[PDB]
Structures are given as C-alpha cells and as structure tokens.
C-alpha cells in the first residue's frame, strides 16, 4: 500500500 | 544530458518447437531517455498485435520494457525485433535465434 503524504521538490 | 543506448534481447517464452503456440519476446533495457520505438517483425514485416509491459527502471535509473506477441514458430519463418532510440543513427534489428 502506497504512502499518502506528498511533498513538492 | 547523459544518454544510454538500449540493450536488446529477442527470445521465446518457452523452448521453440515448430508448429506449437508460443510467445516471442523483445526485452529492451539499460536505456535513457525513456522514449523508445520497438517493433516485432515476421519476415521483415511489422507484426500487428504487439503488447508491452509498463515502463519501469533499475537501481541505476535506466529503463526497461518487455514487448511480446503470441506466435507459432515454423522452420522457414524469420522473426526479429527492430529498436529505435535517440542514441541510434539507424534502427537496430536483432534477429530471433532459437538457441539464444
């Protein structure tokens, strides 16, 4: 199952 | 941009036996950038229904793809995979050798 949280570079 | 030329292997899923249904594979790997044209050919002619895996990559970031089609090998029929990439001045054509 994938990680939910995301962050821009 | 660093560019990396594709490695190419052409082979069958199972031991080739004449008259018996099988899968012809063309595996391209070690390449960058990801844009690539790959065709499977039967006696010089482009094979119509060719499927492919979804784009993925190795530890070193280089891409790989598997192209494949259901086929029946015979004694006289020739098969090959034709590959074009930005690193190539002309498309590379690798013949299918049933012992390779």
């Amino acid at each position: 199952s994938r990680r939910w949280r995301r962050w821009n570079r | 941009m660093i560019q990396r030329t594709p490695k190419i292997q052409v082979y069958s899923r199972h031991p080739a036996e004449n008259g018996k249904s099988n899968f012809l594979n063309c595996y391209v790997s070690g390449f960058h950038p990801s844009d690539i044209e790959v065709d499977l050919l039967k006696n010089g002619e482009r094979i119509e229904k060719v499927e492919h895996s979804d784009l993925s990559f190795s530890k070193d970031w280089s891409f790989y793809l598997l192209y494949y089609t259901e086929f029946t090998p015979t004694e006289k029929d020739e098969y090959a995979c034709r590959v074009n990439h930005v690193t190539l001045s002309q498309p590379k054509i690798v013949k299918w050798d049933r012992d390779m």
Binding site: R2, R3, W7, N8 | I2, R13, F23, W61, D99
Partner: protein, 276 residues
C-alpha cells in the same frame, strides 16, 4: 528468505504534446502487482497479480487518489526544476522516484528507501539512517532545505518502518503459494562447434523465480570470469526468468568445464557438464 516491496514512478514532459506522462508500478520481490498509467483511457490503479485482486474497493480508490496526486506533484516539480536548472521549456525532462522496504526472513525492516532522479541522474536520496539526505547538486540542496523544514525524513521513516513492512507482510501471506515458493531453474548445457578446433558451451537456466541467480563457468575448478559471456537475466513473460552463460573451449577439452548454478529454489547448488 528476505523480501522487498518497491514502488517505481516516472514522469516525462513532452513540450507541445500536452501534459507530462506519469507511469508507476509496484513490485513485491520480482512480482509486478499494481500499475497506473496517466495515458490510459480511464486511469485507475489496476491489479497485475492474482493475490492483490482480493483487496476491496476502498483499497483501489485510495491507491488511485495517491497515483493521481503524485502525477500532479510531479507536473509541478518538472516546472520548478526548469527554474532551478535555468532550463528552457523546449526539452523533454524526466523525474524518477523509487521507495520501499527490504525485510529479513523474520519480516523485520532491514533497509528503507526513498530516492529520486532528474534526467536519469541522482537528485536526492534518503540515507539508510532514514533521518538525513544525500543531495546530488545545488538544485537538490534547495529541495533538501524544504524537506528538512517539513520533516519529510521523519515522515518517511514512519511510513517505511510501519505501513511498508506491514503491507508487505500482508501481501506475502496472501500470495504465499506463489510469492513464497521459489521455482528452481530448469538447466541444461549446449554445445556448438565454431570450427574444427573449438566450440561454444552454453549453460542455460530457465523458468526460475525469483530473478536472483549466479551462473558461472569454471575450468579445472577455477572461475572463468574474463572468458564468460553472460546475458542480463530476462523475463520470460509468465513471471519467471531466464539467463545463460557461454564459454569458448578447445575441441575435446569440454570435460574440463563445469557450470555452477546458485539459486534459492535449488536444494543444493548445481554443477553441470556437457553430456555427449
């Protein structure tokens, strides 16, 4: 033995041809189990292994939202990186990311990964400590400063040590009949005359799983690394793998050469010779 789960992501810009293409795949060990392609007619994450199909609709909805959201962040990041690298809008550029976990036979975390590449070269990587970064160039240092502020490393640590290992454990059990049953290679040695004085010996390994294998030719019990042609391990397309190794030998000296095969599916490592 030991196991892994990995998610791979690739975005490729295509100036003048619409929005970047996003493709992501997931693996357990060497088994592809999920896929998403932003160019599919109606994009959703889809199953690619029978043991994942049992997951409920809520699973597929969440996975699909994550993929779509990741595609959007990569579109934004491609535009940001043109500014970081002072690049024009003329060229195609590539962002890659891989993350996941390696576990031991006890299902405990051995190593977590989260690492990125731009135009095929290292951009930024989470270190093995799961608390610090390796940034490859001055652009990636900007990203590092942003990610330190936002405690990205701490959040990845929590994901990789928890969710990643646990979902891997779940998949291994659900898929045990195929994931935890190694298929040993089927092997044979072939002989091919080149001339009256020499011949090729080719050692074949077919239908094996997982992909990790060692195929070596020895002469008089010594490894022949220099003289051995060894092809990249290749997918058969039915979830198993293929590989061969070949040496060129003098006519009549074939009995001096042994092919050695190591694979986890074999009870014992094999020693093969050509049988005339």
């Amino acid at each position: 033995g030991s196991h892994s789960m990995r998610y791979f992501h690739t975005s490729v810009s295509r100036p003048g041809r619409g929005e970047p293409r996003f493709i992501t795949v997931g693996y357990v060990d060497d088994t592809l189990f999920v896929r998403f392609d932003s160019d599919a007619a109606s994009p959703r994450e889809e199953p690619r292994a029978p043991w994942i199909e049992q997951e409920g609709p809520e699973y597929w909805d969440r996975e699909t939202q994550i993929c779509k959201a990741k595609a959007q962040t990569d579109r934004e990041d491609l535009r940001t990186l043109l500014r970081y690298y002072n690049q024009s809008e003329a060229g195609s550029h590539t962002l890659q990311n891989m993350y996941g976990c390696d576990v031991g036979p006890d299902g405990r975390l051995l190593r977590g990964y989260h690492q990125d590449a731009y135009d095929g070269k290292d951009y930024i990587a989470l270190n093995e400590d799961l608390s610090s970064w390796t940034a490859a160039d001055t652009a990636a240092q900007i990203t590092q400063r942003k990610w330190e502020a936002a405690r990205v490393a701490e959040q990845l640590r929590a994901y990789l040590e928890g969710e990643c290992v646990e979902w891997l454990r779940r998949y291994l059990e659900n898929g045990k009949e195929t994931l935890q049953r190694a298929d040993p290679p089927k092997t044979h040695v072939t002989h091919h005359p080149i001339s009256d004085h020499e011949a090729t010996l080719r050692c074949w390994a077919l239908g094996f799983y997982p992909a990790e294998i060692t195929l070596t030719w020895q002469r008089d019990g010594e490894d022949q690394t220099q003289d051995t042609e060894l092809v990249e391990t290749r997918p058969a397309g039915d979830r198993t793998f293929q590989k061969w190794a070949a040496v060129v030998v003098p006519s009549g000296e074939e009995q001096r050469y042994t092919c050695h095969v190591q694979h986890e599916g074999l009870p014992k490592p094999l020693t093969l010779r050509w049988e005339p």
